Every structure is written in structure tokens, then in C-alpha cells.
Amino acid sequence: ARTSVTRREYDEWLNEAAALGRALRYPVRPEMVNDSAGIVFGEDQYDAFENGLWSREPYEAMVIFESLNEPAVDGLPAAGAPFAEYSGLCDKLMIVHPGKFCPPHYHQRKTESYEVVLGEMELFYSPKPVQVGEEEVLSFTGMHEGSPWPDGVALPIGREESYAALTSYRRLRVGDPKFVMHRKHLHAFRCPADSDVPLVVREVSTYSHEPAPLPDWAGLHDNSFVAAAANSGRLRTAIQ
Amino acid sequence: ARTSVTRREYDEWLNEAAALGRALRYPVRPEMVNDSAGIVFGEDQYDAFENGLWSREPYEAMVIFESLNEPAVDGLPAAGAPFAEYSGLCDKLMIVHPGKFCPPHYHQRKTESYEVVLGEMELFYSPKPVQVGEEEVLSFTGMHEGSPWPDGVALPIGREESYAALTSYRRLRVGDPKFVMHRKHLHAFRCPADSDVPLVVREVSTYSHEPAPLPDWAGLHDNSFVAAAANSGRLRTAIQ
Amino acid sequence: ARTSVTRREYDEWLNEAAALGRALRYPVRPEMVNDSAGIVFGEDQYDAFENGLWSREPYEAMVIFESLNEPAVDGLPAAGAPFAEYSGLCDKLMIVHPGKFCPPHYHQRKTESYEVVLGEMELFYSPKPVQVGEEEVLSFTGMHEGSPWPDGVALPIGREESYAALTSYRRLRVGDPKFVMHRKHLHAFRCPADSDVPLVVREVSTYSHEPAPLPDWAGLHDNSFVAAAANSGRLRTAIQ
Amino acid sequence: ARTSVTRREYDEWLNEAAALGRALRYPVRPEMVNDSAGIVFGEDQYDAFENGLWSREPYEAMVIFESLNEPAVDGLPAAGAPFAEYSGLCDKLMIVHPGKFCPPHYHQRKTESYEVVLGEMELFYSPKPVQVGEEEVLSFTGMHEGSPWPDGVALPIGREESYAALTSYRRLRVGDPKFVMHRKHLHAFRCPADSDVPLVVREVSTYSHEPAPLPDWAGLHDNSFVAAAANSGRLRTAIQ
Ligand SMILES: [Mn+2]
Ligand SMILES: [Mn+2]
Ligand SMILES: [Mn+2]
Ligand SMILES: [Mn+2]
């Protein structure tokens, strides 16, 4: 069971990913292609590189080039500081290879939108949000129900369970309408294992908190993954 | 002095603009190409169509295809409703022809980011925000100073003044970093008059209020144009 | 019945076409955007501009940006001069708006290939080549049969006849294999009248003779259009 | 000294190259992505894979997706068969990684054109053609002189000499005019070692003879590489 990705493996992975992005017209500047864009969700997932990203095997891994992550604090009424973290502007391109996933997780503050740039995205999610604290929350459009998963979705071994709660399915393609994923909703997507290209999608969402706009913003955790193993990973990718 | 755009003029304008968008890989669906995307800022500006969009003359006009404008209310703490309008997710592509402008204006709630897809964008703005009400506002990164205007920027006749306060300049190109324009800041951009293609840019910003997420969101005006004439226009484009 | 295209009409037509080209990644340099790229096939066809290129009306018109047209004479054996004209390298992008056609014609020397860049191309042609002279010609792969025309192909009024001989149909899309159109074959294509974007296609073919590589190449006519009217046009477009 | 490329190495190499192609809008169909597109020029060059394609090391290797290679025999006068091989239509996209080369070689029949799709191409060539046989050859535009090589062009070890005769230099970029390379001219290009993306270029040339349009076309060799070692390779790539 591999426990890390080699330097060559990582660089080629993010270097191909970077060029594929620019071609697809995304402003990926070298500053952004770094030892953090490449993500492996868990020590169990480093086996993704035992056969390669073109192996078509079910693993939790991806690359994320972030071009923007504006807090949007400036100009906001002082009385809005308490809730300023539920706002903000994040823009990032994500690259997922055939068969690979972006593990089941939900965000307390972040609300995301998806725009397929290349390939097809099989989105999985829970139509019901999670009750984060006894506090009262607003409603409006919520998350619709969606469709039944298509047959044959191979899930990473040992993470089979983390997908249970994500009953709703959705197939987003290039050209489709923008898809909104409200905070507090369990989501996860994958690139069809039999894809001919890597899934590529522009994520326009609210601020991305990653472990100072405001003092109370200091190291906030906004990523909550079902499978605990995934949590010990998103933090960084072990590169030899 | 023409006082409206003919049906053919408008359709060709938005239909070229629509195709140009899809080619540049923006998800412009026909639903979005409507009698509203095409905007003429003021009765004084319908003269843009006397010689055409490729006349290279200084006029205030543009097309905006909006793919997303999510309120981001769902999942927000009830106690955040008062400030929920300062958040939200808007995604739109804008097309500005050579010599044309997006008139001087500022938003009280909206914070924008720019990503040049095609061409070059000559951004003009005021380094100081405006004092909207006696209420207290937050700070953090603010707006940097920028550079002096390049010589020879022809401004639309009769609107010469509205650009005065926008002393800071900036030339954003394809590939450059995401450019953030904080709310309360006077902004305005143009496509260089001697351009060979239309300027095209992806605007990722906070919710765009246009004349119901929450009761108090009912018909909110978040667009404040310097030149009053521009105001009586953004509302709609007179098409014969 | 309009008998010419105005300067603004022409410029806007080729200027939108030019930018759409670069966006689709075709090397359209300004030298190429000239008073010749825009083509109207016959005086009967200037009525295309009566309602516009977005009229969706059946007319023979198009724009052709030629990036290459190499004779490929250098390095060729002296003994090959007689047949050097059937060789050469031409590279051009073509833009056809919804409902418009590229009139029925055949080339004696030129053999073309099509690559759909944007939109869909409805190709019409004759499965049998024409007997040009009593001279003996070679064979090999020839032109396959193809399919029946789909219902509802509106043809330009008065040119209805010139399409008779082109019984074979073919719908080429972006991604499809390269389609080869051998010389001596009657062809003509159009952009589906109900298209949402202009048809755009990369034509890679042999040398394009337009009214000196070799003395005998001096002003050669390699374009032979069925409808006589089309012939007196391809020469130039009447611009006011 | 590695003497072959592993299955995974090969696949990932061509799989990334294939998707990069489609993104840049080239019609790369799966049939085209095969155990031949990936090319290693010589057993001395398999060490390219010891550190990877992103090693930035000087090696002779590349991938070539061929979409068209029409003989253009059909419709040609019987009396033209002797010279039909100097004609034809080849269309292919080529992918060269940072620091890698396309070894010095010349073609007796083929004449090529280059169009940079992505990156920058540093083309090297000899301004004088080679005298292939006592036969007489035609002339017209020939090959201009060009420029001095830029300092610091690292050449693959052991092949340093094969570049000597290619004294003329040229830097072709996206948007530049079509570049024509006449047959009988020694050429070779590379992607700048410090490139951020792989060089990608559309090669539109005459028929590409690879070891039956006409009987005398049977297995013709039109590729003549300076370094002998390169010749024993282009034939096939050793994959474990
Ligand atoms: Mn997420
Ligand atoms: Mn604005
Ligand atoms: Mn033709
Ligand atoms: Mn060659």
C-alpha cells in the first residue's frame, strides 16, 4: 500500500493538469501550480498512483488551481462581521481523472456552483442539509431531489460507506446551466471511469476556509468529510 | 440622434456576442440570449448604432450573459438575513466592442472580480470607496492605487465628467491574476478603441440586484451610475 | 433586390467572423481580414443583407480567411511541372451563418478535407465525379454514397436547380473524422438554418487557384459553379 | 540506460497528450491514440523516461496524432502518377514537452507547414536543400535564411552533431503566419526547455509515407534523419 506520491509523479500530474487548464482557457499562473494543488484524500488513497491516474480505478484524488479567494470584507458594515465568513468569492478549476472522486463532504459556510469545462461530471449529494448546531437557519430554494445513481459506479474500497447519505445523482455536462450546491449539503462528484479525458470544472463558490480577514476567521475549518481518513489528508499530499 | 436599436441590429449584436462566448468556452445557453443582455447606457448612447459596434467610437454599451445569480440564502443563519444581500454568487460574461465603455458606477453591496477571456481591458476606478450612509464599514485589503491613465482615452461625449473621480487605471490581460473590485468603489472599463476583437471578460461577483430571496430584498437597487443619463438606460434597451 | 453590401455591413460581417475565428483558435491575422474574404455568390445573393446574416434565410454567401496557399513547387522534379497544379497546400477557415450555403461547384485540380470547428455542417455532393476532358484519370478510394437529404432543406430561390446533381448528403460535426472531397466532385454545404452559432470549418486542401508558381499556372480557373450566376460573383463582393 | 517505456508511462504520455489536443480543439479520436503516436527517436533516447517528460532534459521524443493522410490520387491524370507521391494531404497535431526535440531530418517528397496551437516552437533548419539524385528540381520561393540560434539550446547528448547543418533558427508562436518547410530541407524543432506547457502544433503537409495508392507507393521511405540512431527508432516505440 503506497504511502506517498513521488516527486516525478506529483509534478507530471500537476504539470499536465496545469497545461490542460490553460488550454481550456483558465488563468492558471505558475504561482498556483504548487505542492498543494495536488490532493490525495487519505493514506488509503495513495494507491491511486500504483497504477496511474489513467488506471480508471476508484480513488479519492484531484488537483485544484485556485485563482481567487477574496474574503469580501472591505466595505461590509461592521455589524456584518459575525456572518462575513458565509460570504466571500472563491474561483478555482478542478481536475479529476477517469474513475477518480472528490470524497463525500459538506461545508458549513461555503456554497458552491459547478461549470463543466471538459468531460462529464457525475455529481452525488444529499437532498437534505445537515443541522449544524441548534442555531436557526434560513431557507429559499434548497436542493432539489435529482436522480437515481446510474448502475456501475465503482466507489473507492473502504470508503464505500461515506457515500451512503448521498442518494441524489446528477450528470452535469459542458453547456448545462450553472449548478448550485448549498452549504450544509453532503456532496461528492467523480469523472466517469470510462472517460476519454479528465473531468475539468470551474468552481465558483463563497470563501474557501483552509487551515486574517477578521480575528474570528483565524484558522477556520469549513471542510467536513464523511470518511475520517479523508480528513487526515486534504491537509496535504505526501510527496517523496 | 438615434433613440433606439433596430431588431436586426440588436439580434446580430447579441447573436455574434453569444457565439463568440460559447467559442471562448462560456456556457451561454439560448435562455440567456434575450432582449435584456444587450445594454445601452442612456438615450445619448443609442448613437453607437449609427455607425456600428466596430466604428471604434466612444459610447456606453455592452452585452451581459448571466449564467448564475444565486442568492446564497439557504443554509445561512437566521441572524444573518440583514446582511445576506452583501453576499450571493453572480457569474456573467461581458462583451465590450472596440472603443466602447461600461459607464462609471459603484455598487453598495456587490464586490466584483475580473478575468479577461479575450482582448484587453482598460479598467478605470477610484482608489477611495464612497461613504454610503452614516453606518460603520469594515476594512482589510481595500483598493490599491494603480496607474495613471494612458494618453488618448476617448470618452463618450457628454459623459466626459462622469469619469473624473475614476483616477486609477489598470490594464488587465488574459492570463493575469484575478482582479478584485470592492463594493463602494467607482469603476468603469473599456475595450481599447484600436482593438482587433471585442473585449470579453468573466465577471465573478456577489449577488447582482436588478429591479424574492428575502422580503427586504424586494426590488433592490445596487447599481449607482455617475452620469444620471446612464441610470435611465441600464433598465432596458429600446428596440424597434 | 439589393445589389451590394454596405461598408458597415461588410466590415461587421468580417470583423465578427475574424474574432470568432481567433477564439476558435484559428491564426486569423489582420492581413487576412480584407475586402475579399467576404464572399457573395451572385447578384441574386446580395439580398442576404436585406434582413441580415442572422435572418436564417437561404442565400449563397460566406467568409474565407486563407492562412496558407503554398504551391509546393520548390524541390519538385522538373518532370512534374505538368501536374504540379494538382498538388500544393491550402489552409483556410470558413464561416457560414444559419441557413446560408456555399453554392454547388466542383474543382478540377483541388481536393479538399473538412474539419468542423464550430456548429454542424450539412454537406451535399454528387457521388460521381465529372469527366473533365477526354484525358484518362486515376482512381482509388473515390467518394462513398452517403445519405438522403434530411427534409426541409430550404435552398436559395432561383438556384434550386444547381443542387439537383448533389444527391448525396452528410452531416459532419466537431470531433468527427476528417472528410475528404476529391476533385471533380460536385459539392456544396450549409449551416442548418436553425443553428445557434455560425458554422465554422477548417478546410485543408490542395492549392487554391484564384484569378506565378509556373508560367502555365498564370491565372488558372479551378472553381466551377453549377449556377452561372454564382460564377460572376465569387470574383469579388460589391461593397458600397 | 533504459531501453523502453513502460505501459503506464506510454499510456499516461499519450492520454494526457490526447486530452490536451481535444481541449486545444484538435479532432483527436480514440482510434488515433495508439501504440504508434508515441515516438522515441532512438534507443539512446529512452532515457527521456528516466526522469519524465517534465524533466526539461534534451531528448528526442514526441507524440503525433494523425487525423488525415489522403493520397489525393483519385481524379489525378494518369500521366501524373510518377509524381503523385510529392502531393497528398496530411494533417497531424504534434506534442513536444519542455526541452524535448523532433530530431534533424529532411523529406524528399513531403513539404510541411507549421501552426503553433500552444506554447512556443524553436525551429532549426538548413537554408539550403539537399541534392537528392542527379535529377533536376524546380524552384520558386525556397527557404529564407532566418536567424542565429538563441544561446543555451541544450541538445541531446550524443546527437550534438546531427544539428550542425541546421544553422538557421526561427521562433514560431501562436498567431504567427503559417510557416512552410519545403521538402529536401533539413529541419528539427523543440519546445523551449523552460516552457510551462507542452509545445503543440498543427502540421499541415503533403502525404506522409510511413513503412496502396499506387504500386510504386508500396512502402516508401520519406523520412531521412541525420543521426543514424534516430532512424532505427521512428519505426516503433519499445513499450514493455
Ligand atoms: Mn466542496
Ligand atoms: Mn459593476
Ligand atoms: Mn470547393
Ligand atoms: Mn518532417
PDB file of N, CA, C and O in Angstrom, chain B residues 156-177:
ATOM      1  N   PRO B 156     -16.972  58.953 -24.076  1.00  0.00           N
ATOM      2  CA  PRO B 156     -18.203  59.355 -24.764  1.00  0.00           C
ATOM      3  C   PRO B 156     -18.540  60.826 -24.512  1.00  0.00           C
ATOM      4  O   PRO B 156     -18.476  61.314 -23.383  1.00  0.00           O
ATOM      5  N   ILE B 157     -18.885  61.529 -25.582  1.00  0.00           N
ATOM      6  CA  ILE B 157     -19.220  62.934 -25.498  1.00  0.00           C
ATOM      7  C   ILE B 157     -20.414  63.159 -24.609  1.00  0.00           C
ATOM      8  O   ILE B 157     -21.429  62.479 -24.735  1.00  0.00           O
ATOM      9  N   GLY B 158     -20.278  64.128 -23.710  1.00  0.00           N
ATOM     10  CA  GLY B 158     -21.357  64.464 -22.806  1.00  0.00           C
ATOM     11  C   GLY B 158     -21.289  63.682 -21.519  1.00  0.00           C
ATOM     12  O   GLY B 158     -22.047  63.950 -20.588  1.00  0.00           O
ATOM     13  N   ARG B 159     -20.383  62.714 -21.464  1.00  0.00           N
ATOM     14  CA  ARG B 159     -20.221  61.876 -20.288  1.00  0.00           C
ATOM     15  C   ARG B 159     -18.822  62.090 -19.746  1.00  0.00           C
ATOM     16  O   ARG B 159     -18.419  61.465 -18.765  1.00  0.00           O
ATOM     17  N   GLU B 160     -18.087  62.972 -20.407  1.00  0.00           N
ATOM     18  CA  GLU B 160     -16.720  63.284 -20.038  1.00  0.00           C
ATOM     19  C   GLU B 160     -16.519  63.389 -18.529  1.00  0.00           C
ATOM     20  O   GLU B 160     -15.580  62.834 -17.974  1.00  0.00           O
ATOM     21  N   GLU B 161     -17.412  64.110 -17.870  1.00  0.00           N
ATOM     22  CA  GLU B 161     -17.313  64.306 -16.436  1.00  0.00           C
ATOM     23  C   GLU B 161     -17.385  63.060 -15.572  1.00  0.00           C
ATOM     24  O   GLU B 161     -16.535  62.864 -14.712  1.00  0.00           O
ATOM     25  N   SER B 162     -18.395  62.227 -15.798  1.00  0.00           N
ATOM     26  CA  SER B 162     -18.612  61.008 -15.018  1.00  0.00           C
ATOM     27  C   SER B 162     -17.381  60.132 -14.758  1.00  0.00           C
ATOM     28  O   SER B 162     -17.412  59.247 -13.879  1.00  0.00           O
ATOM     29  N   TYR B 163     -16.301  60.384 -15.501  1.00  0.00           N
ATOM     30  CA  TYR B 163     -15.069  59.614 -15.351  1.00  0.00           C
ATOM     31  C   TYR B 163     -14.025  60.291 -14.458  1.00  0.00           C
ATOM     32  O   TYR B 163     -13.068  59.651 -14.027  1.00  0.00           O
ATOM     33  N   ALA B 164     -14.224  61.577 -14.178  1.00  0.00           N
ATOM     34  CA  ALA B 164     -13.321  62.367 -13.337  1.00  0.00           C
ATOM     35  C   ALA B 164     -12.807  61.651 -12.077  1.00  0.00           C
ATOM     36  O   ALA B 164     -11.601  61.452 -11.885  1.00  0.00           O
ATOM     37  N   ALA B 165     -13.735  61.274 -11.214  1.00  0.00           N
ATOM     38  CA  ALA B 165     -13.395  60.602  -9.964  1.00  0.00           C
ATOM     39  C   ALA B 165     -12.663  59.266 -10.125  1.00  0.00           C
ATOM     40  O   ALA B 165     -12.070  58.772  -9.167  1.00  0.00           O
ATOM     41  N   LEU B 166     -12.701  58.678 -11.318  1.00  0.00           N
ATOM     42  CA  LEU B 166     -12.040  57.392 -11.538  1.00  0.00           C
ATOM     43  C   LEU B 166     -10.589  57.541 -12.003  1.00  0.00           C
ATOM     44  O   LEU B 166     -10.214  57.092 -13.098  1.00  0.00           O
ATOM     45  N   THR B 167      -9.776  58.146 -11.134  1.00  0.00           N
ATOM     46  CA  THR B 167      -8.355  58.443 -11.397  1.00  0.00           C
ATOM     47  C   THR B 167      -7.362  57.285 -11.557  1.00  0.00           C
ATOM     48  O   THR B 167      -6.294  57.450 -12.169  1.00  0.00           O
ATOM     49  N   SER B 168      -7.692  56.130 -10.990  1.00  0.00           N
ATOM     50  CA  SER B 168      -6.818  54.973 -11.089  1.00  0.00           C
ATOM     51  C   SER B 168      -7.063  54.191 -12.369  1.00  0.00           C
ATOM     52  O   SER B 168      -8.202  54.009 -12.788  1.00  0.00           O
ATOM     53  N   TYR B 169      -5.973  53.732 -12.975  1.00  0.00           N
ATOM     54  CA  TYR B 169      -6.010  52.964 -14.211  1.00  0.00           C
ATOM     55  C   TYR B 169      -5.490  51.559 -13.965  1.00  0.00           C
ATOM     56  O   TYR B 169      -4.845  51.297 -12.947  1.00  0.00           O
ATOM     57  N   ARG B 170      -5.745  50.669 -14.924  1.00  0.00           N
ATOM     58  CA  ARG B 170      -5.314  49.283 -14.833  1.00  0.00           C
ATOM     59  C   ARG B 170      -5.574  48.572 -16.152  1.00  0.00           C
ATOM     60  O   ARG B 170      -6.676  48.666 -16.696  1.00  0.00           O
ATOM     61  N   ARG B 171      -4.566  47.877 -16.676  1.00  0.00           N
ATOM     62  CA  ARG B 171      -4.735  47.140 -17.917  1.00  0.00           C
ATOM     63  C   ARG B 171      -4.655  45.648 -17.628  1.00  0.00           C
ATOM     64  O   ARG B 171      -3.576  45.099 -17.397  1.00  0.00           O
ATOM     65  N   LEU B 172      -5.806  44.994 -17.643  1.00  0.00           N
ATOM     66  CA  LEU B 172      -5.887  43.557 -17.375  1.00  0.00           C
ATOM     67  C   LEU B 172      -5.925  42.727 -18.678  1.00  0.00           C
ATOM     68  O   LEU B 172      -6.701  43.000 -19.596  1.00  0.00           O
ATOM     69  N   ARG B 173      -5.068  41.712 -18.745  1.00  0.00           N
ATOM     70  CA  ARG B 173      -4.967  40.859 -19.921  1.00  0.00           C
ATOM     71  C   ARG B 173      -5.277  39.415 -19.578  1.00  0.00           C
ATOM     72  O   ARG B 173      -5.370  39.043 -18.403  1.00  0.00           O
ATOM     73  N   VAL B 174      -5.445  38.610 -20.618  1.00  0.00           N
ATOM     74  CA  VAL B 174      -5.725  37.186 -20.467  1.00  0.00           C
ATOM     75  C   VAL B 174      -4.529  36.552 -19.774  1.00  0.00           C
ATOM     76  O   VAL B 174      -3.398  36.760 -20.195  1.00  0.00           O
ATOM     77  N   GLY B 175      -4.772  35.775 -18.727  1.00  0.00           N
ATOM     78  CA  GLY B 175      -3.681  35.134 -18.008  1.00  0.00           C
ATOM     79  C   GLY B 175      -3.341  35.820 -16.687  1.00  0.00           C
ATOM     80  O   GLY B 175      -2.895  35.165 -15.747  1.00  0.00           O
ATOM     81  N   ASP B 176      -3.548  37.136 -16.615  1.00  0.00           N
ATOM     82  CA  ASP B 176      -3.239  37.913 -15.413  1.00  0.00           C
ATOM     83  C   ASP B 176      -3.975  37.372 -14.187  1.00  0.00           C
ATOM     84  O   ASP B 176      -4.819  36.454 -14.292  1.00  0.00           O
ATOM     85  N   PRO B 177      -3.654  37.916 -12.998  1.00  0.00           N
ATOM     86  CA  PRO B 177      -4.285  37.491 -11.749  1.00  0.00           C
ATOM     87  C   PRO B 177      -5.719  37.980 -11.736  1.00  0.00           C
ATOM     88  O   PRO B 177      -6.068  38.881 -12.494  1.00  0.00           O
TER      89      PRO B 177
END
